[PDB]
Enzyme design. Structure first.
Site, PDB file in Angstrom:
ATOM      1  N   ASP A 152      -3.841  14.953  16.668  1.00 53.40           N
ATOM      2  CA  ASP A 152      -3.322  14.992  15.320  1.00 53.40           C
ATOM      3  C   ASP A 152      -4.430  14.603  14.332  1.00 53.40           C
ATOM      4  OD1 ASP A 152      -1.343  15.497  13.403  1.00 53.40           O
ATOM      5  OD2 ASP A 152      -0.537  13.444  13.489  1.00 53.40           O
TER       6      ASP A 152
ATOM      7  N   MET B 202       6.336  -0.219   6.918  1.00 54.67           N
ATOM      8  CA  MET B 202       5.558  -0.572   5.737  1.00 54.67           C
ATOM      9  C   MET B 202       4.137  -0.991   6.044  1.00 54.67           C
ATOM     10  SD  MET B 202       6.579  -3.276   2.740  1.00 54.67           S
ATOM     11  CE  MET B 202       8.036  -2.221   2.516  1.00 54.67           C
TER      12      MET B 202
ATOM     13  N   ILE C 189       0.843  -1.205   0.000  1.00 54.42           N
ATOM     14  CA  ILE C 189       0.000   0.000   0.000  1.00 54.42           C
ATOM     15  C   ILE C 189       0.880   1.259   0.000  1.00 54.42           C
ATOM     16  CG2 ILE C 189      -1.681   1.399   1.311  1.00 54.42           C
ATOM     17  CD1 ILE C 189      -2.825  -1.414   2.252  1.00 54.42           C
ATOM     18  N   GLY C 190       1.692   1.430   1.041  1.00 52.03           N
ATOM     19  CA  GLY C 190       2.563   2.592   1.168  1.00 52.03           C
ATOM     20  C   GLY C 190       3.483   2.503   2.368  1.00 52.03           C
TER      21      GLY C 190
END
EC number: 2.7.11.24
Length: 342
Positions: free
Chosen positions: A142, A31, A24-25
């Site tokens: 956040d 990861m 995915i990213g």
């Protein structure tokens, strides 16, 4: 039958329950992949985490694991499983398994116009989640579009509690230009002036920012550095009133605000001419300069904009509100023990 699976040259070792890995990213640091869960017959997200060299990365990992395991809410991402070695000595990584969420509000906003119905529904779910978090005496700290996960049916789940803290209003005060960790464009004005971000009002500002962003597909206050962020805010809200300045006792902070040219409020309906007027009324109340006057989560939920969804009996609150790296590792080990074959 199995081995140490690799993805982009790195061990992604989650088997045998989790097969057919797709990348995915990147995560905070580590990861992220989807994978087929062979027990519950669905694809899942798995995040690889490697924090044990650094006490800060341990602190954030532990903090987030502790929080997400204690929380159980439809609008907060759950931890389904945690994969790690059976012993502290062999534990170099931890894999966190979560429900697979196709997208997030950052990606969505970069590519898709949102209907008013979508904006309304997304805002309801953000606040419903936030009600639960705040009821546990937790600040997320956040909130931003990339931390709002969405699946194919637009179920929204808050994630990324790495910067979260227990609320502590009596110890919120600080001096002018005190350094801050959370994402710049979603920071309340007071962070730059006199606040450590230890009160619930910090999260409502971020939600206000996200609402504005959903209305136009652009961040409302895109500051390029610490103090530009404040001058972005004041260019829309206008100069704070005498009353609101009298709440800021710190002289550096107060004198900074007094040094600026007078700026008038930009009306919300000129900034967002196609917005629903009830959405703009609620935006105004969330993006209030003075944190003591800013709307609270429960009040936001009860606002006329959300009347189609508002149902306090179906907006649950938490049952259970709430160091060297070597000891943080042991605590991460203990915290993840419940997922071990047993």
């Amino acid at each position: 039958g199995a081995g140490p699976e690799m993805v982009r040259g790195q061990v992604f070792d989650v088997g045998p329950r989790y097969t057919n890995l797709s990348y995915i990213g990147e995560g905070a640091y580590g990861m992220v992949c989807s994978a087929y869960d062979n027990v519950n017959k669905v694809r899942v997200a798995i995040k690889k985490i490697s924090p044990f060299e650094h006490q800060t990365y341990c602190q954030r990992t532990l903090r987030e694991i502790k929080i997400l395991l204690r929380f159980r809410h439809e609008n907060i991402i759950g931890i389904n499983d945690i994969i790690r070695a059976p012993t502290i000595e062999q534990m170099k990584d931890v894999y966190i398994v979560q429900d697979l969420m196709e997208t997030d509000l950052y990606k969505l906003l970069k590519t898709q116009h949102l209907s008013n119905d979508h904006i309304c529904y997304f805002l309801y779910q953000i606040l419903r989640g936030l009600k639960y978090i705040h009821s546990a005496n937790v600040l997320h700290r956040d909130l931003k579009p990339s931390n709002l996960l969405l699946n194919t049916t637009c179920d929204l789940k808050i994630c990324d509690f790495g910067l979260a803290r227990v609320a502590d209003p009596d110890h919120d005060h600080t001096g002018f230009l005190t350094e801050y960790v959370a994402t710049r464009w979603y920071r309340a004005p007071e962070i730059m002036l006199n606040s450590k971000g230890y009160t619930k009002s910090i999260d409502i500002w971020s939600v206000g920012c996200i609402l504005a962003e959903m209305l136009s597909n652009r961040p409302i206050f895109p500051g390029k550095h610490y103090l530009d962020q404040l001058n972005h805010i004041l260019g829309i809200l206008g100069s704070p009133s005498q009353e609101d300045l009298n709440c800021i006792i710190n002289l550096k902070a107060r004198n900074y605000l007094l040094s600026l040219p007078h700026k008038n409020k930009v009306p919300w309906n000129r900034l967002f001419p196609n917005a629903d007027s009830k959405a703009l009324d609620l935006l105004d109340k969330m993006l209030t300069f003075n944190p003591h006057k800013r709307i609270e989560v429960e009040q936001a939920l009860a606002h006329p904009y959300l009347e189609q969804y508002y149902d306090p009996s179906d907006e649950p609150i938490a049952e259970a509100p709430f160091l060297p790296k070597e000891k943080l590792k042991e605590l991460i080990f203990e915290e993840t023990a419940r997922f071990q074959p047993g």
